[PDB]
Each structure stands twice: as structure tokens, then as C-alpha cells.
């Protein structure tokens, strides 16, 4: 149901307190929610879209120089002047040549020369910016009870298509059959705009830092500039060849497109062509499940003779998906689905697609469940037509908690302080961890920022070393939070 197959599954369960839970969801990740009632849903952020951009600065990439003129002057009588030096299209430089009687002036000294050539661009890079309002997220909500060929397809209409703006509110989502879910999304604090500058080259696009964008050495121009002739730091794309003490010349430095593609190693590529669509980042959701119904009560229990048509097919960490075909009853009915051990005694293992249901009998309905570790026996239907199907979930252990620990530490690595969500009013634990993580990550960033892949590992080894050989049991201070943590972030960056 759009979530099986994606390798970032992120089951969240526990709707304690009222009937809300906090979730946060990226573009590359989908989220499956479970409760004791109130059937399971799947949440995926499909597109971020900023509506109305405003260009702030236009860097140039390739240019050319025409009208190359020069003028010199005899030594000690000052420096020359040229009529087109008055324009700020013509890039200029004064330099010393030596002059004598062969040059035709006199005094045998070192004169001064000037050179003008008009600087006309031919490839513009414009960097647009957007405000945190009028940008529109889009999230899809698809439910379970998997009628056929709705498993992981991005295409097809199978989920509700609500859209999030910071102009918006409670965001009612009346998805049919079930109840009506509401989402208190917070899109202002999601991606931290007013630093995002959405620069657009020839046909590609990127999402860069603002202060990185403004101090970029290239001949720039203001964003509100019509008739783009008055380029400002034109000397960063020209050079003045004064090889010996003779006449000097100008040459265009060349296309900066490839060097700019080397400048962008670390910026997530976005799509600015027929709409400024983004496909990175996240947003924080408050997921209220006051009004949801199971769709399954007031249907009779089934009568038997099911049939499997797609095999048991474990995909992606123990959440098996089996597709069954039904033949013969009053066709709207439930499914006698359960997971037993060998001697059919203990209901061990959890059903994820809760309360499955057969509708319009000649159509498959596929079922998702979570077996225990080891042998389990998936049982469909009643006794004249049971399907007792073995499954051996590939034997894991304690190690499922260590891979949950790795997805938690990685989730704290990509998301800094927002990663203390997936939790519903932790109170005395969640809020203090979020506050301490704000005051630690706020002095981690902007006091360890700007460095690369390597330098985080290097400073991690330095702090680990000078902590490990310290005294007075400050070694725990200089190791457990700044040594191996920075060494851990040294191998997770450049994502």
C-alpha cells in the first residue's frame, strides 16, 4: 500500500495521551502507523513546491570581450585616460610599461598604460529565493486493506491527496470507507528557508546556502536588474596579460560551468523547470486520529476456501506480503487470518494490515503481517478450506534492536533536533532530550561547521586522543559525547 518495498519503512505505534502522535517524514521515506484500533495508514511526502520566487542576484558564467582598446602615456606625466573608461561595461586596468625613444615619447622611463574592453555575458545563473509562506507541501495518505495491485506503486489513485500550506489549518482528510484523519502540520520550521537560494543554471537547479551563494567569486548583478550590462566584479572573469614590459591585452577567462559543477558537491539537486518543485527535506506532522473507523465491523465472518495467487514473499525486514484469492459466499466478508506456532495454540506475531476484507469476490486482496523470529504458520480461512502456510523468518535476535539503534542514530544524524519526534508526549524524557539536544546541537553546529568529510574524522581523532590521555575522569566528557560522536558523524555526512 505504497509503503511496502521502500527501504525506509519506519513503523510508528502508540497513540497515547489523546488520540494524536508525532511523526516526521522525508521525501525518500514513507511512514506506517499502527494502533490497537483505528486501522493502519501510510504517509509519504511526494513533493515540496515553492510558488512565487524572487531573484536576488544573477551570476554570469560565460562572457566575451569586444572593442579592445588601449592607451599609454610618456613617463612621469601621469596616467592615461580613455573615453570608454567612463562606462562600467568596459573592464579596465592600469599598468606600467617602459618607454623610450623607440616608443616615440622620450624621458627613458616607465610609463603607464590602460586597456578597455566591454564585458558582455552570454550565460546567466540566476539564484531565486522564496519566503517561508506560499510554499506548498504535498502528502499522500493511503490506507491498508490491500485490494489487488496496490502495494508499492507510485502511480495510480489509491490514496488521499491533501496539500499543506503554512496558510492552512487542521487539514481535514476525509478518506473513504474509513474515518477522517486530521494533520497539524508545521511547515514553517521544516526546511528553514530564508537561507535557501534556489539557483538555476542552464537546465538544472540546486538548493544552496545563502551566505555561500552571496560571496561566490563571479561577475554578479542585482536581481531586480533589467538591461543586464552593469556587471559588478567583472575582474573575476577577465585577466590582463602583461608578459614583458610591453603592451598588455585582455582575454576572457572561459566558461565557469564545469567549475561551478565542481562548486556544487554537497547541494541537493532540485527541479526548477515548469514549477519550482523540490524533492528533499522533511516536515513535522502532528497526526490526530480522533475519528477513524475500521471499515470491517457489520460484515459477517467468511466461510472458507481461499487460494494463494502471489507467494508469501518477505520484502524488507520481516513484514511478509501474501496475496490470496477467494471463491464463494455472500461476497462482502472478512478474512480469518492469524499467525500461530506449529501446535495451533499461541497467537504470536502481529498483523499489520489489520482487519482484512473481501469485496467483489473475484479480485485478490493481499495481506501484510509481521511474523516472529523463526518458525510461524500463517493460517487463512476456516477448517474445511484452511491454508496453513509455513514461514521461517530468517533468524534474527537481539540484533533487531541494534539495527533499530542504527536507524535511530542515523535518524538523529540526518535530522538534528526534529528526530526526537516519532514520540507522543514523552513528557519527562522526550522534552528534556529535545531541549538538551537543541543546546548541544546548537553549539555543535556553527562551531564545528564548514569542515568536510575528512576534518570531522581528524578532529574526532584529536579530541578522542587528548581525552583518552587526560586526567581527573574528564576522559568520559571528551570521549562519550564529542569523540566517538564526531567520529560517527564523520562517516555519515555527504548523504
Amino acid at each position, epitope marked *: 500500500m505504497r509503503c511496502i518495498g521502500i527501504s525506509n519503512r519506519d513503523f510508528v505505534e502508540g497513540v497515547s495521551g489523546g488520540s494524536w502522535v508525532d511523526i516526521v517524514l522525508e521525501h525518500g521515506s514513507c511512514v506506517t502507523t499502527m494502533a490497537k484500533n483505528k486501522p493502519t495508514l501510510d504517509f509519504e511526502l511526494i513533493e515540496t513546491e515553492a*510558488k512565487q520566487p524572487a531573484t536576488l542576484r544573477k551570476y554570469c558564467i560565460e562572457a566575451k570581450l569586444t572593442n579592445t582598446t588601449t592607451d599609454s602615456r610618456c613617463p612621469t606625466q601621469g596616467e592615461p585616460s580613455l573615453n570608454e573608461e567612463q562606462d562600467k561595461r568596459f573592464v579596465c586596468k592600469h599598468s606600467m610599461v617602459d618607454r623610450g625613444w623607440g616608443n616615440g615619447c622620450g624621458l627613458f622611463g616607465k610609463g603607464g598604460i590602460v586597456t578597455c574592453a566591454m564585458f558582455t555575458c552570454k550565460k546567466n545563473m540566476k539564484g531565486k529565493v522564496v519566503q517561508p509562506e506560499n510554499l506548498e507541501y504535498t502528502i499522500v495518505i493511503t490506507p491498508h486493506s490491500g485490494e489487488e495491485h496496490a502495494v508499492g506503486n507510485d502511480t495510480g489513485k489509491h490514496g488521499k491527496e491533501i496539500k499543506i500550506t503554512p496558510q492552512s489549518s487542521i487539514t481535514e482528510a476525509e478518506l473513504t470507507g474509513y474515518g477522517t484523519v486530521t494533520m497539524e502540520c508545521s511547515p514553517r520550521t521544516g526546511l528553514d528557508f530564508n537561507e535557501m537560494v534556489l539557483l538555476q543554471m542552464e537546465n538544472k537547479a540546486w538548493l544552496v546556502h545563502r551566505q555561500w551563494f552571496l560571496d561566490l567569486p563571479l561577475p554578479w548583478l542585482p536581481g*531586480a536588474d*533589467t538591461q543586464g550590462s552593469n556587471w559588478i566584479q567583472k575582474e573575476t572573469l577577465v585577466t590582463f596579460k602583461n608578459p614583458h614590459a610591453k603592451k598588455q591585452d585582455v582575454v576572457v577567462l572561459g566558461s565557469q560551468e564545469g567549475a561551478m559543477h565542481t562548486a556544487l558537491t554537497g547541494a541537493t539537486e532540485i527541479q526548477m523547470s515548469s514549477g519550482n518543485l523540490l524533492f528533499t527535506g522533511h516536515l513535522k506532522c502532528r497526526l490526530r486520529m480522533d475519528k477513524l473507523q475500521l471499515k470491517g465491523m457489520s460484515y459477517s465472518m467468511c466461510t472458507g476456501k481461499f487460494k494463494v495467487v502471489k507467494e508469501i514473499a518477505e520484502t524488507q525486514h520481516g513484514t511478509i506480503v501474501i496475496r490470496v484469492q477467494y471463491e464463494g459466499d455472500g461476497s462482502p466478508c472478512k478474512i480469518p487470518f492469524e499467525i500461530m506456532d506449529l501446535e495451533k495454540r499461541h497467537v504470536l506475531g502481529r498483523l499489520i494490515t489489520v482487519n482484512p476484507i473481501v469485496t467483489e469476490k473475484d479480485s485478490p486482496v493481499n495481506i501484510e503481517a509481521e511474523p516472529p523470529f523463526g518458525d510461524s504458520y500463517i493460517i487463512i480461512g476456516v477448517e474445511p478450506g484452511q491454508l496453513k502456510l509455513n514461514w521461517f523468518k530468517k533468524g534474527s535476535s537481539i540484533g533487531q534492536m541494534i539495527e533499530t539503534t542504527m536507524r535511530g542514530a542515523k535518524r538523529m544524524a540526518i535530522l538534528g533536533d526534529t528526530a526526537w519526534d516519532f514520540g507522543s508526549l514523552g513528557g519527562v524524557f522526550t522534552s528534556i532530550g529535545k531541549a538538551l539536544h537543541q543546546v548541544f546541537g546548537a553549539i555543535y553546529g556553527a562551531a564545528f561547521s564548514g569542515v568536510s568529510w575528512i576534518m570531522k574524522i581528524l578532529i574526532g581523532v584529536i579530541i578522542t586522543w587528548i581525552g583518552m590521555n587526560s586526567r581527573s575522569t574528564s576522559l568520559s566528557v571528551s570521549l562519550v559525547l564529542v569523540g566517538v560522536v564526531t567520529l560517527y558523524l564523520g562517516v555519515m555526512v555527504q548523504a
Partner: antibody
Amino acid sequence: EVQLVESGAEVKKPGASVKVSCKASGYTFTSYAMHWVRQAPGQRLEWMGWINAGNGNTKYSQKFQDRVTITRDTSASTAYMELSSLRSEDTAIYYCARDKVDDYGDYWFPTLWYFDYWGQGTLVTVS
Amino acid sequence: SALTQPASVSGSPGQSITISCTGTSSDVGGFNYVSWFQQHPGKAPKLMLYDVTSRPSGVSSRFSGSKSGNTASLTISGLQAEDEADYYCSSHTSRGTWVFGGGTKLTVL
């Protein structure tokens, strides 16, 4: 209570200069700007506009920057319009346009509204 | 340096009409200084809108406007016979000058 009357002209000749005037009533003259708007017959409303004030520091137009100047006087509360070097396309219906000046005496930014009240229009012609 | 509202629009009485106007990033794309006017053919053009959604006293609540970047749209909901007149837009540039629109002729019958 705010009424803006104007003074019309019958017909002109190209090569002459026209001087249309306008009396402002219902409000004082010292803290109010008074612009000028063209309306050629069946055309776009062009902008003669003059940012007058109680001091008289006034910006020209852009199309008509070095072609027209104006005068004013406070005791008559009249902003004038001395359109010199008349041509064949200079026939239009000229309006005086009330505008409000900042309370610091200067006129740096205009208000949220521009033109609450208008003149009736003077249909000048050339011949 | 001119506004490009269209030539003429029309709509039956009871419907809603929309009048758009596109401009540069120096007068409408960055600033909120957009206003509208009612030029009756035998009258001076009367101020029908202040700032992009605002409205003068005396003007009925039938008139409403919006702005979506470089485009400022005027919406008249529930037209009547007293709207058969021209509509001129306006914008204050960042330079310091004013530009007006071409003019839309509105008919209902």
C-alpha cells in the same frame, strides 16, 4: 467635502505652450501632493505626474523629462501645468490628482492610497 | 515600463469576472503598491481599490483583488449593469514613477 476643480482650454497650435490650472478645496495645500494624469481619446492613461509638496521639490516625468516644467502657489492653492513644445499627439484630457504627503514635510514614499479625489478633466486640443 | 491588462472582457449578470494585469519585478513583483480605477466614459476615473486587497470607503464589497507575483488579478463577483465602464490598473515602480494599464472594456449584455 473635498472638491477639485480645473481650468479648461479650447484649442491650441503646435509650437505653442498650454497652461492649465486647478483649484484645490476642502483641505489644506501644504501637506498634499498633486499629480497629473493624461487621458488621450481611446488610449492608455499616461503619466505627466509631478510630486508637488509644501516646499516645491518636484520630480519630472521620464518620457517628458526635458520637455515640460510646472509652477505652483500656496496662497491660491493652485498647481499649474506649463506644457511647452506642443505637438499633434498632445491632445488629451488632463486630470489633477490629489495625493498625500508624509508628516515629516518631505515626500519620500507615497501613501497606501494614491488618488482619493480627482479633477473633472480638461480636454485640450491642438490645431 | 507599462502594464499589460487585456483589451476587453465580458460576462453575464450573476457570474463573476476576473481581470488580470502583468508587470515587471520593479512595480508589482516585489511591492504591494497596486490599485485599480473605474473610468466611466463621462467621469473622472474613480478609486475602487487601495492596496492589493483593500478598498476605499463607499466602494461596495463586490470588488476584491489579489496578487500572485508579477500578476495582480481583480475579481468582480456578481456583476450588475452598473459595471459597464473601463478598468485601469496602477503600480508604483521602485524607480519612483507610476505606470497605468491599457484598459479593459466590460459589458454584461
